[PDB]
């Protein structure tokens, strides 16, 4: 088999018009081109897929001939063959091509890597369910390198497909298969699958986001009792809970998470260990609780959780006889301002007259040192110099102190009010 015979048999199959299926001998010469050298194989990678549609009786031999070219030592031969693989995904051959293409994602040649992604997206437009089966079966059973590339494929290339391809049943199948994977994913893998699932059109609804919230709830294992001593137990709960924040709306509640933080995390906040430099593990817990408290519904043990939240607030609001942690107070005072609406009797009861008397004294003493630090910040801030790392701290510090001052005045109404609305400092406009 030489380049002369391959070109001549190419013309036999090309000039055959509609009498192509009878020249099976000419197509066999092309199939034998894989046994030739470099120039012979570079032509076989083009001619085998071009006339594959005219010889179903040679399907297995043709797909095998192209697969040998996909595993050739020369990368230029593989690139010529991988590009034409979607031509073979006709009929019962697509799940086999999907398995080969998913296997080929582990290549480290940037040119070959792009051709594998384009071929995967090509058969995806052909048979979406068939290609997903070839991808997820490798995520569930293949090597770690294949599972890694295949997850990244869904994480980055699903957004490039037309909406005509991602039908309702395709999004149903992805959720069905993803829940099979989520029973054994790492911390980073779970972050990728949450981006994949939340990107689906049918899961962006109110009912769809509630299903995603339940997925991270079972992933967080909220029935597991909280252990404050383990450093990885906290970093896993925080990372798993951060994936639930973008899904919370006024009808997609965070009650299961706020209940867990108030019951088991707040009473043990002092025992929190951090193994990473420059990371305040306790403030990050309070930051996360402050974001979720805006979407909490009717709680299981509302009064007990409200007291645990109120007790932790008084630890950072001292009686008038020290440094004031405004960052800690902003998170705790906001969360109590959110959850306190559900039980105004926590302050406006005749039994709680001592708690309300003591609380308004702490709010008044805190406001004295707060308003001193407010104008002290605005004195040092009197568009380019504001972008310095030393001045940006005073900008967010002014947002922290202003939010605290707005919440204190809202609570120091003789009937304590809860109608003020603030934007958390670490949240953009």
């Amino acid at each position: 088999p030489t380049v002369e015979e391959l070109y001549r048999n190419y013309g036999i199959l090309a000039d055959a018009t509609e009498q192509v299926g009878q020249h099976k001998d000419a197509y066999q010469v092309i199939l034998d081109g894989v046994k030739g050298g470099t120039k012979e194989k570079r032509l076989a990678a083009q001619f085998i897929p071009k006339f594959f549609k005219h010889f179903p009786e040679l399907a297995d031999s043709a797909i095998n001939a192209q697969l040998d070219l996909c595993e050739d030592e020369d990368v230029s031969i593989r690139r010529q063959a991988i590009k034409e693989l979607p031509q073979f995904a006709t009929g019962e051959n697509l799940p086999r091509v999907a398995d080969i293409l998913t296997q080929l994602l582990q290549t480290d040649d940037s040119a070959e890597f792009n051709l594998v992604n384009n071929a995967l997206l090509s058969i995806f437009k052909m048979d979406a369910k068939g290609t997903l089966g070839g991808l997820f079966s490798q995520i569930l059973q293949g090597e770690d390198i294949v599972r890694e590339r295949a997850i990244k494929f869904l994480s980055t290339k699903l957004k490039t497909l037309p909406d005509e391809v991602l039908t309702k049943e395709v999004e149903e199948l992805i959720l069905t298969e993803s829940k099979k994977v989520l029973e054994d994913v790492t911390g980073e893998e779970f972050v990728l699958f949450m981006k994949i699932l939340s990107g689906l059109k049918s899961l962006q609804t109110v009912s769809g986001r509630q299903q995603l919230v339940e997925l991270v709830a079972e992933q967080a294992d909220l029935e597991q009792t909280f252990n404050p001593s383990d450093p990885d137990c906290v970093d896993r709960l925080l990372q798993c809970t951060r994936q639930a924040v973008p899904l919370f709306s006024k009808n997609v509640h965070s009650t299961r998470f706020v209940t867990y933080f108030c019951e088991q995390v707040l009473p043990n906040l002092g025992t929190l260990t951090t193994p990473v430099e420059g990371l305040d593990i306790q403030l990050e817990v309070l930051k996360l609780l402050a974001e979720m408290s805006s979407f909490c519904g009717d709680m299981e043990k509302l009064e007990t959780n409200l007291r645990k939240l109120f007790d932790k607030l008084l630890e950072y609001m001292p009686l008038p006889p020290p440094k004031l942690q405004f960052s800690y107070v902003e998170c705790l005072l906001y969360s109590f301002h959110q959850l306190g609406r559900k039980l105004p009797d926590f302050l406006t009861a005749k039994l709680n007259a001592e708690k309300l008397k003591d609380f308004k004294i702490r709010l008044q003493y805190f406001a004295r040192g707060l308003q001193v630090y407010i104008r002290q910040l605005r004195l040092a801030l009197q568009g380019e110099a504001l972008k310095t790392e030393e001045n940006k701290i005073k900008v967010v510090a002014l947002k922290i102190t202003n939010n605290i001052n707005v919440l204190i005045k809202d609570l120091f109404h003789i009937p304590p009010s809860y109608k003020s609305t603030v934007t958390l400092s670490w949240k953009p406009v």
Partner: protein, 126 residues
């Protein structure tokens, strides 16, 4: 002979803490991965943490803990597989296997089954 249980899923060694935690760690020389496999009846073994003086167990909801005393939940069916990897199936809850996840935690027994990468453990020397 004391052994280490090397899990095929991720490569974790089965670890038993003195407080009763069961998980996996990749460090070869962790003091709490030294295990002693006591033979009970034919085909059933018990796993004891040497440095922890606790026995591996699986309770009602497929969670793995380490009790200080041998209980009903401390016996497991040991089946030899390929290759030199073994599976440990709870004798009381006969459908749940001892398993470690990719994250290193124990896998809930209610989510374990035959033919999983998480249930295969390799006895190692030292």
């Amino acid at each position: 002979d004391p052994k280490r249980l090397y899990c095929k899923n991720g490569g974790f060694f089965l670890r038993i803490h003195p407080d009763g935690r069961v998980d996996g760690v990749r460090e070869k020389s962790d003091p709490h991965i030294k295990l002693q496999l006591q033979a009970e009846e034919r085909g059933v073994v018990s796993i004891k943490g040497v440095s922890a003086n606790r026995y591996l167990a699986m309770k009602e909801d497929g969670r793995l803990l380490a009790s200080k005393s041998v209980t009903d939940e401390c016996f497991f069916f040991e089946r030899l597989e390929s290759n030199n990897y073994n599976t440990y199936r709870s004798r009381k809850y006969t459908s749940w296997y001892v398993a470690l996840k990719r994250t290193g935690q124990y896998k809930l027994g209610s989510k374990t089954g035959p033919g999983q990468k998480a249930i295969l453990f390799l006895p190692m020397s030292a």
